[PDB]
Amino acid sequence: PELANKLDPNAKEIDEPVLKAATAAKEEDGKYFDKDGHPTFHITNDGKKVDWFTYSGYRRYHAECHVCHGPDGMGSTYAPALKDSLKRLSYEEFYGILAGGKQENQVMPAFGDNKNVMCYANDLYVYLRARAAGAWGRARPGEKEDKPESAKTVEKECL
Ligand code: HEC
């Protein structure tokens, strides 16, 4: 139905198993979920329009993560490429690394005490999930879906 994606027909780096596991099964007010109950994306009109959290997660990524992890999750001299990471990592593995950090030299900081990051954890997951599935390229999202009212009142409370 309207839960289905419609991506770039000239999308050359799609990962079908990762994309299939990210198919939207449910929608609760601008928020999409997969059959496992975990957040997911929703691309529309041939790879140009994106759901709110993919849009929002891009911006939070550029703000708070791009420095060590490179543009579009491509990787850097000090940190791995998160577009490949979210092929293996489950939603809760990602959330735990983000909240508590990871070490080996090589340190990923714990962001748990950083509400400007933790309150957008689902946004970061969704966007980087869309990268891992090859459902979004290395562009900035243009057309988006409207920001839902649900997001604004929990953004209120979380911050
Ligand atoms: C500073 C440099 C940063 C910043 C600001 C962020 N990350 Fe994180 N990250 C970083 C390192 C050195 C590592 C590797 C740690 C190790 O080798 O043990 C990581 C790792 C991750 C992971 C797990 C990667 C994997 O195992 O595949 C995730 C997920 C991750 N980083 C995500 C992430 C996000 C969402 C950030 C947003 C603010 C972020 N990092 C910041 C170094 C750094």
Give a quick rundown of the structure.
The PDB classes it as electron transport. This protein has 159 residues and is mainly alpha-helical.
Describe the structure using short key phrases:
binds heme C, two-stranded antiparallel ribbon, 159 residues, mainly alpha, 42% helix, 7 strands, 3-stranded antiparallel sheet, iron
Provide a descriptive summary of the structure in words.
Keywords: Heme, Iron, Metal-binding, Signal. Residues 56-127 form the Cytochrome c domain. Disulfide bonds join 119-158. Residues 140-159 have a biased composition (Basic and acidic residues). GO terms for molecular function: electron transfer activity; heme binding; metal ion binding. 42% of the residues lie in helices and 10% in strands. The chain has one domain (1-159). The strands form three sheets. Strands 1-2-3 form a three-stranded antiparallel β-sheet. It has a two-stranded antiparallel ribbon with strand order 4-5. The chain has a two-stranded antiparallel ribbon with strand order 6-7. The radius of gyration is 15 Å and the shape is globular. By secondary structure, the protein is mostly helical. The chain is built from eight helices and seven strands, in the order H-E-E-E-E-E-H-H-H-H-E-E-H-H-H. Helix 4 (82-88) packs across helix 7. Bound molecules: heme C. Heme C is lined by residues 64-65, 67-69, 78-80, 82, 85, 94, 97-98, 102-104, 106-109, 111, 117, 124.
